[PDB]
């Protein structure tokens, strides 16, 4: 009752979040200069970390 079991799904979601926080910091520092009418919501995101 005090020991919890985690499956592959929970670990995968955890690692997805670990990558997502890095991509979040990246998109936040990239949004510091992006203005209106200059970029589509595609270039600010990279595949690398996640």
């Amino acid at each position: 009752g005090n020991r919890r079991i985690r499956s592959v799904g929970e670990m995968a979601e955890n690692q997805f979040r670990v990558g997502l926080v890095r991509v979040e910091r990246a998109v936040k520092e990239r949004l510091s200069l992006g203005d209106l009418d200059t970029l589509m919501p595609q270039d600010m995101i990279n595949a690398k970390p996640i």
């Binding site: 009418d37 200059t38 270039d43």
Partner: protein, 210 residues
């Protein structure tokens, strides 16, 4: 601070201007590095720059704005433009564009186009409302382009014989067939002078290859 304002004045004005701005000796650099360093040091004082140039499409997707000072070639002062602007505002080769520009940002090496203001001497809002070239219906020339000055100068004869030998019109297809050292250069110069005098509304451009 516009790009053309440094694009057209001779190298000497650039020399005195940079020597006034407290520069490293600009006489050691090329015209393009002259304008590049001057625009760098101007933006280093905190000014938003304006610029202009003709667009060239590259195969990697992005485009580059060239000037007539470099005869439309690659240079340090060419303005980089992203492919997505070419998408949204419907850009392509030949579109001359003037608008907001900034020097290359941190780690970059070419100017960036912020805000489009004039596309081929038009509003960028109507620039998307254009007709293509191959979809055009060609015709023969109907409007006469009179080449005679009417002042009767000594060289003007070479123009009047034009109106007597081979008439020209808007959209004409003309071929000059002549051996070397026969007088093609003076003929072409008189053609350009007469067109720029009698028809200043039509844009006039000249190609000199090799």
């Amino acid at each position: 601070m516009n790009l053309t304002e440094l694009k057209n004045t001779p190298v000497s004005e650039l020399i005195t201007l940079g020597e006034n701005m407290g520069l490293e000796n600009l006489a050691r650099m090329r015209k393009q590095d002259i304008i590049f360093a001057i625009l760098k040091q101007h933006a280093k004082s905190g000014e938003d720059i304006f610029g202009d140039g003709v667009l060239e499409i590259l195969q990697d997707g992005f485009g580059f704005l060239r000037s007539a000072d470099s005869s439309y070639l690659a240079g340090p002062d060419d303005i980089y433009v992203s492919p997505s602007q070419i998408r949204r505002f419907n850009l392509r080769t030949g579109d001359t564009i003037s608008g907001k520009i900034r020097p290359p940002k941190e780690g970059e090496r070419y100017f960036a186009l912020l805000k489009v203001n004039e596309v081929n001497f038009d509003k960028p809002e109507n620039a998307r409302n254009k007709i293509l070239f191959e979809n055009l219906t060609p015709l023969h020339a109907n409007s006469r382009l009179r080449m005679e000055r009417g002042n009767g100068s000594t060289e003007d004869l070479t123009a009047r014989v034009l109106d007597l030998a081979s008439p020209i019109g808007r959209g004409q297809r003309g071929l000059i067939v002549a051996p070397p050292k026969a007088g093609k250069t003076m003929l072409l110069q008189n053609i350009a002078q007469s067109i720029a005098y009698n028809h200043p509304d039509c844009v006039l451009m000249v190609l000199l290859i090799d």
